[PDB]
Symmetry: D2
Subunit: 214 residues, 4 copies
């Protein structure tokens, strides 16, 4: 069983579904994704920024515990530092930073052994372009928490890893040395790997999925 | 002229004073530091988490603008992720993350050309030990903002750089390959370098000052 | 139809990468440098399980030897799709105690050897190709006595990034897998948070994935398969 | 009383590091590898300004040549306190277009040469010593054609970190300075946020500081002096 907060988020839920995960989709479309997942032979609102507890109980109710979580839930306004309102700011923090922290806090306590946790960052943390400051600053915090979390979860056979996709007219396709555009499927594949059996030994890492932009 | 938010913070103010900076010390002892600075031939409360504006006007008042800022102001409780209250959390964020952001927001607008900005991180961002999660997560955000800020300040001949000291009984002295303990003077020296003429070309960097622990 | 060269593939991690690539369906060229026995064992096993493999002796620090390897594989099976640089050596010496032969050796095998295959691959690898370099987690850990090994492997990582950009326009990815230690014992078993010893197959996992369909978008990357240690 | 060896110190950055160290008060050994003229110029200038310098030819890829250098300096002035590894070369080739001589050369000079002085320094550097390796910002940038240069320099960075730990107990720091490009022109002048071209003296600044009193606590570090470019 896998909870999936937060396109990319859809792809992820679907893929895990295909893989064999009962996916507790999470919004704050959702039906749509759930319908396809069931139509396809596969098998909950909450603002990640309290609710987070109900969300976990929700599923331990239905399926009897959680084995995987994927913190896709995030928002990305784009302001320079000089022109960033306290409102723009605390929101970006609340959603991305606190949200993750919140679910990580719960996952910290609930998750079954053999588990997998996979946060969603951004190759902008590395690229640190103008106006991605706040966004990058926020996701940066997530990366650090991914690292610390993984050692903090010692002895409970759980892994914590992040995934920083890149962008996902044509010049943006030619940005990657691969000279095409990232698909939400590309990222889902990455996530699928960590949550898969081939990702069992990868732990406390930031996997950039960007087709070679950095 | 240099503003210095936030031991280490004292050392910094003093050193810049010695160097020749009118230092607008900032608390939320301060006199003490100011007295010594004047006693020594050298020459403002605000919670960095609005106040930040008064603080800048305060000095543009007295001395007619600001040339340097040093975001030492920070707090460091130490909780694992599982055991971290919403109160512990948002505070660590507010002080470290928002505080810096706040002063950076102001510095973004005010600072004279030829300026220097120097945020205070922590080699724990790299070491990511248990319970430094939130602290590291917070300072991480600062590092990213340091990077983005520096490119965002293009054309205004200002530099943005951070400084991540390490710790500053005897086993902690023997932690560094140098086998002694960090002094608040050590860190001040680093900061002094960036704000000095020898730091004019260093820009958008995280200088770890830890005696070789990482 | 798909063909992979695996360098240093006679034992442990390399053997496991070879077995897994074969299992994925790659015809696997098992490259070794010394006695051929172990490598034959790996080939046999791949065969007994319904895969295709060929063994090929060649010392990777040797530019000509390396060219033969690629040619032998194109001869036999019509081209190369995947390259895996596992060959390496890891004598441990502090910098102060490193003799010239030791320094030169670590460099030749680890850096020049991988460079040799990298250069060849850039010329011959089929479009849609995947290249996985083996690094080490010591590039981050950086413990005493690992300085020469890590310097070489750090160089490999740099080449990994730059090559992926140089290969623009050919749909070839280039990544590396940085393994931690694989197979006081409890202490080393519990070294990682997962508190178990990592395995040849764990690493074969990340490789299989980078070469796989679930990796297509990953390149220019160092992927550490160490189990949470750094 | 304090003595610094500066390697590759006849021009540009190396000259500026030499002049500055002299100005700080170090007796500076100006190490060059080719014709001695420029290096003599640097020595003269240091002299005319009230400093002490000595020039010393030696090719750093040569372990023996390197040992002579350190011995010449201990002979003359009684020991070594500071080592600065500026010698290097930077031919640009894509990996696919790198000949063996080019590869081997970049490695010998940049990696082996710096290793040679590193090994020597570990044996002879006086306590309280400072060692600064010159890297490059390309270790991060990693542009096409810079793959061999960056691999070598990445290796230097790895050695920098590991050596600082290996030198535990002797109060010797080890760091590196990674310069960006120093001296379409407006485009390159405006390459950095500061939007001016960086200078030999800018780099001499970060070096002077790492060797200085305001650096004592810094080690195991790569310090990029590129002007905000990465």
């Amino acid at each position: 069983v896998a909870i999936v907060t937060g396109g990319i988020g859809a792809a992820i839920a679907a893929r895990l579904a295909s893989d064999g995960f009962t996916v507790v989709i999470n919004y704050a479309a959702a039906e749509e994704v759930a319908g396809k997942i069931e139509a396809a032979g596969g098998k909950a609102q909450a603002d990640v920024s309290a609710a987070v507890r109900r969300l976990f109980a929700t599923a331990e109710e239905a399926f009897g515990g959680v084995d995987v979580l994927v913190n896709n839930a995030g928002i990305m306004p784009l302001t320079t530092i000089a022109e960033t309102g306290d409102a723009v700011f605390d929101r970006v923090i609340a959603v991305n930073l606190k949200g993750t922290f919140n679910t990580l806090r719960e996952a910290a306590q609930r998750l079954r052994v053999g588990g997998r946790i996979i946060n969603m960052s951004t190759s902008q943390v590395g690229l640190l372009h103008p106006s991605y400051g706040i966004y990058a600053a926020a996701k940066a915090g997530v990366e650090a928490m991914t690292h610390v979390l993984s050692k903090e979860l010692r002895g409970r056979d759980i892994t914590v890893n992040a995934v920083a996709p890149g962008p996902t007219r044509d010049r943006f396709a030619k940005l990657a040395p691969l000279e095409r555009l990232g698909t939400p499927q590309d990222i889902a594949g990455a996530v699928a790997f960590l949550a898969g059996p081939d990702g069992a030994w990868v732990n406390g890492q930031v996997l950039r999925a960007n087709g070679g932009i950095i």
